[PDB]
């Protein structure tokens, strides 16, 4: 993307959250613990009505917008902390998150059927019930492994498209020609079956993560606003490769 576009999106987000989201930020700041997790709920229709350029920049790459909004929220947190009058019952948190809700009623964004293969990288909204439920488990994210034959440390990350496996690097990004677990998250696995009232239906393997864990009850109606992505499998010689379609959740609702 262009250099100015991300910046402009940042100012739009920070202005909106500063003008109409002071109360939730104030309550989040006035809380115990330092690094657990803290989300912020932001509506959509008002934001897209305020400016006609955020929607175009958003609904083709649902990847950078969330990170930019997170950065804007962090900058707002720094600003409100700096301009504070009662610095006694307050605490600073470095773990904030975004949560979009309130999409339009366009026929292509309120799909009641699972997309087959033509919706990858899009922002959708599916509805259904719950069948199965896995157990709470903890992943490892980033290693910062020991520096070999050079000096500057590395910050390589994991990959979601390869079942969270780590690839061994060999080409160091060092300027010269030289080239050679206190981190945790949360996890879960839920399966959603389409309702028969509005129709045999098939099912999706929705993947939850972070604060959304432990928020579903077996046998309840859900409405998830998540991105659709693909999960590969390690390749074997002269066989048929296997793929699957999952839905990384970005919000949730308990509407019934």
């Amino acid at each position: 993307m262009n250099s100015d576009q991300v910046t402009l999106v940042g100012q739009v987000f920070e202005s909106y959250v500063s003008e109409y989201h002071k109360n939730d930020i104030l309550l989040i700041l006035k809380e115990r613990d330092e690094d657990a997790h803290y989300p912020v709920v932001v509506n959509a229709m008002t934001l897209f009505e305020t400016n006609m350029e955020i929607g175009e920049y958003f609904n083709m790459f649902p990847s950078e917008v969330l990170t930019i909004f997170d950065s804007a929220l962090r900058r707002s947190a720094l600003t409100i902390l700096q301009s504070l009058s009662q610095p006694e019952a307050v605490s600073m948190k470095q773990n904030l998150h975004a949560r979009i809700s309130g999409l339009p009623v366009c026929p292509e964004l309120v799909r009641e059927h699972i997309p087959k293969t033509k919706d990858v990288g899009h922002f959708l909204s599916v509805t259904g019930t719950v069948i199965r439920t896995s157990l709470v488990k903890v992943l490892e994210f980033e290693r910062d492994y020991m520096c070999n034959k050079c000096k500057h440390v590395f910050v390589i990350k994991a990959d979601f498209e390869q079942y969270y496996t780590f690839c061994r690097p060999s080409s160091c990004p060092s300027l010269e020609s030289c080239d050679s677990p206190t981190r945790c998250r949360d996890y879960q696995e839920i399966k959603i079956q389409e309702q028969v009232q509005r129709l045999i239906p098939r099912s999706m393997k929705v993947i939850l993560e972070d604060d959304l864990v432990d928020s579903c009850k077996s046998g309840d109606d859900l409405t998830i606003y998540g991105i659709v992505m693909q999960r590969w499998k390690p390749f074997q010689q002269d066989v048929r490769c296997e793929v699957e379609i999952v839905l990384k959740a970005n919000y949730i609702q308990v509407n019934n």
């Binding site: 613990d33 657990a36 206190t182 945790c184 998250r185 432990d214």
Partner: peptide
Amino acid sequence: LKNVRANYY
């Protein structure tokens, strides 16, 4: 319980 997920390591 019900509050030991990630941080309490």
